[PDB]
Design a protein around this nucleic acid. Structure first.
Ligand SMILES: [Mg+2]
Ligand SMILES: [Mg+2]
Ligand SMILES: [Mg+2]
Ligand SMILES: [Mg+2]
Ligand SMILES: [Mg+2]
Ligand SMILES: [Mg+2]
Ligand SMILES: [Mg+2]
Ligand SMILES: [Mg+2]
Ligand SMILES: [Mg+2]
Ligand SMILES: [Mg+2]
Ligand SMILES: [Mg+2]
Ligand SMILES: [Mg+2]
Ligand SMILES: [Mg+2]
Ligand SMILES: [Mg+2]
Ligand SMILES: [Mg+2]
Ligand SMILES: [Mg+2]
Ligand SMILES: [Mg+2]
Ligand SMILES: [Mg+2]
Ligand SMILES: [Mg+2]
Ligand SMILES: [Mg+2]
Ligand SMILES: [Mg+2]
Ligand SMILES: [Mg+2]
Ligand SMILES: [Mg+2]
Ligand SMILES: [Mg+2]
Ligand SMILES: [Mg+2]
Ligand SMILES: [Mg+2]
Ligand SMILES: [Mg+2]
Ligand SMILES: [Mg+2]
Ligand SMILES: [Mg+2]
Ligand SMILES: [Mg+2]
Ligand SMILES: [Mg+2]
Ligand SMILES: [Mg+2]
Ligand SMILES: [Mg+2]
Ligand SMILES: [Mg+2]
Ligand SMILES: [Mg+2]
Ligand SMILES: [Mg+2]
Ligand SMILES: [Mg+2]
Ligand SMILES: [Mg+2]
Ligand SMILES: [Mg+2]
Ligand SMILES: [Mg+2]
Ligand SMILES: [Mg+2]
Lengths: 63, 51, 77
RNA sequence: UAUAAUGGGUCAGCGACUUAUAUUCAGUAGCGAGGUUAACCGUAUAGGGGAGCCGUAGAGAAAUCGAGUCUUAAUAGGGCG
RNA sequence: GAACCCACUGUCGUUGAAAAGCCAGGGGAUGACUUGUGGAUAGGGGUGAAAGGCUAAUCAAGCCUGGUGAUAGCUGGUUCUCCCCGAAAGCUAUUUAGGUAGCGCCUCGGACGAAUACCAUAGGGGGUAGAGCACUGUUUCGGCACCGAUGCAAACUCCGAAUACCUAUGAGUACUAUCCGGGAGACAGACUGCGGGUGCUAACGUCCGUAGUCAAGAG
RNA sequence: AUAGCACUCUGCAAACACGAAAGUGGACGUAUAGGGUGUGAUGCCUGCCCGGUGCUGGAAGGUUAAUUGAUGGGGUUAGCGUAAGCGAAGCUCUUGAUCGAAGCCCCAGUAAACGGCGGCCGUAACUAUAACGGUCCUAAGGUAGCGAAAUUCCUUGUCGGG
RNA sequence: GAUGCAGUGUACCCGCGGCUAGACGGAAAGACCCCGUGAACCUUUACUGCAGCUUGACACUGAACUUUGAUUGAGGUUCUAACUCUGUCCCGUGAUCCGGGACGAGGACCGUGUCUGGUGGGUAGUUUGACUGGGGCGGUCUCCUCCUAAAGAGUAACGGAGGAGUACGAAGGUGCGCUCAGCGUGGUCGGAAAUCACGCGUAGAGUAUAAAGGCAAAAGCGCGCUUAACUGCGAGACCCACAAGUCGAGCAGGUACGAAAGUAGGUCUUAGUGAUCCGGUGGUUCUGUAUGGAAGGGCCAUCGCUCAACGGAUAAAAG
């Protein structure tokens, strides 16, 4: 049968030209104690690690 | 016990910082001067409940 | 039972670049809990007493001054 | 593991990595900035059928632009290209 | 106390004559008694003077057929031939510890080349072995907390190697290093030598570091 | 298991049980009868405790469901406003004023209901006894009778009989 | 724990009747012990459902009097027509079923349907951690400092010793300024010890807190003014399985202190901490299912976990 996407992973990863991008953790709450440097540097997207790319591709066959 | 509070800008921008204080040693509402990125100036921020 | 059994995680302090090595600006030279080494020319000190290069060049260690402190500096060209 | 650890009294016959679908990577063949049909029709492996799929462009959550886009007051810097 | 109904003791038998018996003894024997025939109660139900007893040699939930080829990180098995290369029993995390995943270690294809290694010179920072009281502890004898002689220390240091380790040049000898992809296995180790904790300076004991061999290697 | 004894439920279309219902047993019986529970001929008899849980009888104060819907806030436009904006009525989203029983919180009774019948000090030394006196607690701190016992660790406790 | 290995001793080949010392003899994939995120049955004040029982609202459900409250409700007294009788008499009939008719006794009660609070091991499905010189009991599970640790990094044990789950609008920034402690002398109550003055040696003091590494341009101690405890970033590097963590020159905007060169992106540093999901609050040039709006969603900033079994299997579980 057709391969089925893992929707949880599909809602966390998006494809780039040569890889995948993701958001960073530790920016949901408990924010007062954190430093301004951490606050500004954890904002935005980053790339998926090579040791995780295989798992991401296996979970998302069509993205 | 140090309670969390938020300091809101007086310019109406809605900008706010967050910090903590000791209620007993500082009963009065805190009031400081800080930079406001929305208007890019320094203005007074006053304490508001962290909620 | 035993009251002991605790220890902290490692911190990996030490010297990262030795004398005669080429370093570009920004490289960390020493990771130290205290200022066992001091910063000379073209070397900056951080909040945790880390020493880093502020210019390109070659690392060098020395001992100078009345107190006899150990200094580390970067020589440019 | 000679082990005093397991299994077999002997012979003959039977006894265990398969099938469908989807996907990815290597070989080989056709065509080639293009490649290719599905259901179906069809005195039927032919010939018709271009709906559709892959490739040819990225960035951004998105509106939006586009060899550039995102962030920013910034024509600076930086991330993806 | 016979028939009849039971089953208290002992020998025998226990691939028996018998999937519960024989033999010699034992208890009740007009009663809450024994027994024939035909009926009723059906499975989380029945019945039980109550032992979880019995319900067709089956009972802490009968049997048969279906879901069904249930699931088992567990145990076992896995069938012809030759050639080339060749591991691991580690770290991290885990309701995790005899499972699994990322990394480390194996193999095949492509790209790339000496950018890699051995050794010689040159530049580097140590706080161990040893040694010693200058600090911190502890220790023996003398003279008035100190002074003169004397000892000790993983958590003492006025000192301080050999080895290891990082860099730059260089002769020779080695298709070495590095990158991109396909496929794995493995995450129970053992002994010996050296430095150690633990134990009794015991254990073919146990836990680490570091080399060799076995594992997977005959003579 | 048993005859005997005690508690408790049941006024009959009885309680109780079976059944999905219809109905059936109880019983063609009826409080001297029927069900449940504990004990177990007979003799002498059966001490104290209602603090806990249960059951029984009280009280209408606090708390509380469905239901009901008083207010308050918002969306949308007819119309107003150079603009920003304001905005009736009709629909619509949300809030929950008031009313609202049993049960529980509260008060008494009940142990042949489930249950409970103590500590620490001076002394007893022959293991640890309210033995006896102090005090601390508790609802209270064992009456009769018996006791190295089908109950005793020390234990083959001590003395006598055989 | 040896017929089968090494060295030795003994022993011509094969039956029959006896015996049970060994072949870790046969018989049953150990019932004891441990393990698997296995099973069954039983218990309860383990968790979560259901039956049963019970409370009230609406419906079946009607009519008359009468009292009290702010046209309407809540209580009392009667009635019959809904409805009940496992009461009597007739008919179907030849029948203790049933149906129809009459009578009698009850009666808007009881009872039933839907909704709803309480009770509920009576039944049903499940849960009840791991490491451990076997398991159990005990102890531990995350973070920081020292020693084991063999002079780079890293390195185990239910190995030897201590700390943490904070504090601070000043204990932060800057300009200026100043140095501890212990001793010897003499001085009012004043004396080992508290206050004053002079002197010799001199970092033992101190650094909010455990220890280590540090601290004279003092990182120790005061004063004046202040909010750089900023916004957007960020060359480069450390450490790393991932997720994370750490240091950072320099560039723009605004700012504080300095005469100026300049210093300032919290505090001498290393502990004072929690991912994802789901929700709350403030902004927003985004989106918003015919169209214009609006609900809802997205982005930015923030709030709610002793998820301490601290990479957190559920919102919810003991024997
Ligand atoms: Mg958020
Ligand atoms: Mg061998
Ligand atoms: Mg064998
Ligand atoms: Mg085995
Ligand atoms: Mg066999
Ligand atoms: Mg065969
Ligand atoms: Mg007979
Ligand atoms: Mg019998
Ligand atoms: Mg007789
Ligand atoms: Mg039944
Ligand atoms: Mg049977
Ligand atoms: Mg069962
Ligand atoms: Mg080979
Ligand atoms: Mg190995
Ligand atoms: Mg877990
Ligand atoms: Mg296992
Ligand atoms: Mg294995
Ligand atoms: Mg030594
Ligand atoms: Mg393992
Ligand atoms: Mg292992
Ligand atoms: Mg080992
Ligand atoms: Mg061993
Ligand atoms: Mg060999
Ligand atoms: Mg009895
Ligand atoms: Mg009696
Ligand atoms: Mg002879
Ligand atoms: Mg013989
Ligand atoms: Mg015999
Ligand atoms: Mg043998
Ligand atoms: Mg055997
Ligand atoms: Mg077995
Ligand atoms: Mg057992
Ligand atoms: Mg199940
Ligand atoms: Mg365990
Ligand atoms: Mg143990
Ligand atoms: Mg060390
Ligand atoms: Mg080291
Ligand atoms: Mg070393
Ligand atoms: Mg969740
Ligand atoms: Mg619309
Ligand atoms: Mg954990």
């Amino acid at each position: 049968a057709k391969l089925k996407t893992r929707r949880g992973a599909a809602k966390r990863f998006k494809a780039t030209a040569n890889g995948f991008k993701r958001k960073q953790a530790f920016k949901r709450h408990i924010l007062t104690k954190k430093s301004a440097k951490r606050i500004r540097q954890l904002r935005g997207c980053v790339m998926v690690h090579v040791s995780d790319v295989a798992s991401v591709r296996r979970m998302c066959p069509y993205i | 016990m140090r309670d969390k509070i938020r300091l809101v800008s007086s310019a109406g921008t809605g900008y706010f910082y967050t910090t903590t204080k000791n209620k007993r040693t500082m009963p009065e509402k805190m009031e400081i001067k800080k930079f406001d990125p929305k208007i890019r100036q320094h203005v007074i921020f006053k304490e508001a409940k962290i909620k | 039972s035993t009251k002991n059994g605790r220890d902290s995680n490692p911190k990996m302090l030490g010297v990262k670049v030795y004398g005669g090595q080429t370093v570009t600006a920004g490289n960390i030279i020493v990771r130290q809990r205290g200022t066992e080494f001091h910063a000379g020319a073209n070397v900056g000190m951080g909040r945790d007493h880390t020493l880093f290069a502020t210019a390109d060049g070659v690392v060098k260690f020395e001992v100078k001054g009345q107190f006899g402190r150990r200094y580390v500096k970067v020589e440019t060209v």
